[PDB]
Amino acid sequence: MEMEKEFEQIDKSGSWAAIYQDIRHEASDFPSRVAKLPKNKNRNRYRDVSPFDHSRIKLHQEDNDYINASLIKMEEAQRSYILTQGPLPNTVGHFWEMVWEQKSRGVVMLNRVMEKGSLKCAQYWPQKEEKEMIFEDTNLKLTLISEDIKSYYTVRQLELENLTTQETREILHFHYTTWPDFGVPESPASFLNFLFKVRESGSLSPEHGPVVVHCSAGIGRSGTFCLADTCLLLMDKRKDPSSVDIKKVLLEMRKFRMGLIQTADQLRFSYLAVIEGAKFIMGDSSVQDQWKE
Ligand SMILES: Cc1cnc(NC(=O)CCC2CCCC2)s1
């Protein structure tokens, strides 16, 4: 079926939970043996969220190459993403090592450091220009260059230096700051404006390594971001945009990382975002402008 009318048909029949459980039943199951080794217990935030062996990002380190991160490679859309958990106190150095080694330009953060009165991720970037961070285990230096705070998100420019070689690179940090503690946003307008800002930066383009995207576990909000981006790109590329099937795209992405889209509400929100976003992608320019005021 098409998307917008399949949407109305699920709303009127109140069957989002049944649709979402079908996806869970059909999703791939692959081994995650490295993630479960005893030496890696303090490298995982949640015991039931692990990267598959076949798609895990390996650190270029002979001692222990493990990080809870997955490469999602979307062949038809020609887009790749690294999805990862929010860094832990003992994995902040690994995180920036991965960014360096994979040649990423951008980092997309979809959570706040504290939510629901608990820590959802470490403070892994500097908050003042004059107070830089040094990661001694991986030999990297990270400096805040600028910060632009907007109503729904913040953009930062960061400098990452490999202290072994004295090479430096500019990394862009895109921080969505307004996802509610419970549930999903009421309108997708600010989330879509945020996605377009990431796109406009060059961070998603083939001339760079894959963008790194994270929330707390790296499957829920993170899955919503890449699912919406990939579906909108396919609708631009194909002759028949109504042939894009969001459930089939989600099952393809779940071949590379488990658990993407954590609730039936997140599934419904992803449909909403693609539907409203299609309005700009197929020709009406002001659509981005209605989102922006
Ligand atoms: C380390 C962090 C500290 N604060 C974080 N998030 C925010 O402050 C959300 C922004 C809200 C209030 C200001 C405008 C809307 S992450």
The CATH number of residue 200's host domain is 3.90.190.10
Distance CA 257, CA 69 (A): 9
Amino acid at site 16: W
From the list 275, 282, 284, 107, the residue with the least C-alpha distance to 189 is: 275
Technique used: X-ray
Residue 112 CA to ligand 1 centre (angstroms): 7
For residue 167, the cross-strand partners are 162
Distance CA 86, CA 75 (A): 26
Give me the resolution in angstroms, 1 decimal.
Answer: 1.9
From the list 72, 101, 256, 242, the residue with the least C-alpha distance to 164 is: 101
Distance CA 277, CA 229 (A): 10
The set of protein residues with a Cβ atom below 6 angstroms from ligand 1 is 112-113, 123, 177
For residue 131, the cross-strand partners are none
Q: Which long-range contacts (CB under 8 A, 24 or more apart) does 198-202 make?
A: 198/106, 198/108, 198/174, 199/229, 201/105, 201/106, 201/172, 201/174, 202/105
From the list 69, 98, 6, the residue with the least C-alpha distance to 222 is: 69
Residues 6+ apart with CB under 8 A from 31: 52, 53
Residue 111 CA to ligand 1 centre (angstroms): 10
Split into its structural domains, the chain has a count of 1
From the list 243, 171, 179, the residue with the least C-alpha distance to 209 is: 171
From the list 32, 43, 145, the residue with the least C-alpha distance to 94 is: 43
Q: Phi and psi for 102 in degrees, rounded to 5?
A: -90, 0
* Angle of the 264-281 helix axis to the 16-26 helix axis, nearest 10: 100
Q: How far is CA 284 from the centre of its chain?
A: 27
Answer whether 192's CB lies under 8 Å from 287's CB.
Answer: no
Task: Verify whether residue 215 is a known catalytic residue.
Answer: yes
Q: For every residue of 144-195, which 3-state class applies, written as one string? A: EEEEEECCCEEEEEEEEEECCCCEEEEEEEEEECCCCCCCCCCCCHHHHHHH
In whole angstroms, how far apart are CA 37 and each of 28, 228, 260?
21, 34, 23
Distance CA 20, CA 37 (A): 31
Residue with tokens 């320019």: 285
Q: How far is CA 67 from the centre of its chain?
A: 16
Distance CA 214, CA 86 (A): 6
Residue with tokens 């992405």: 253
Amino acid at site 91: T
In the chain, what's the furthest Cα-to-Cα distance?
A: 60
Q: Which domain holds residue 219?
A: 1-293
Distance CA 187, CA 276 (A): 10
Beta 79-84 vs 211-214: how paired, if at all?
parallel
Residue of minimum CA distance from atom 8 in ligand 1:
177
- Which residue among 121, 177, 194, 214 is best mutated to probe the pocket of ligand 1, counting the most ligand atoms within 8 A of its Cβ? 177
Answer whether 17's CB lies under 8 Å from 35's CB.
Answer: no
Answer whether 89's CB lies under 8 Å from 122's CB.
Answer: yes
Q: Phi and psi for 44 in degrees, rounded to 5?
A: -115, 130
Residue with tokens 């995207």: 213
What is the number of the ligand 1 atom nearest to the C-alpha of 152?
15
Residue of minimum CA distance from atom 15 in ligand 1:
151
DSSP for 81-105? EEEEPPPPTTTHHHHHHHHHHHT--
* Angle of the 246-253 helix axis to the 16-26 helix axis, nearest 10: 40
Residues 6+ apart with CB under 8 A from 156: 125, 144, 145, 146, 147, 148, 172, 173, 175
First to last CA, the chain: 33
Q: Count other Cβ atoms within 10 Å, centred on residue 4.
A: 15
b/e sequence 86-120, b meaning 16+ C-beta within 10 Å? bbbeebbbbbbbbbbbbebbbbbbbbbeebeeeeb
Beta 211-214 vs 167-176: how paired, if at all?
unpaired
Residues 260, 263, 264, 265, CA torsion sign = negative
What is the number of the ligand 1 atom nearest to the C-alpha of 177?
9
For residue 80, the cross-strand partners are 73
CA dihedral 263, 268, 269, 274 (to 10 degrees): 130
Residue with tokens 């197929």: 282
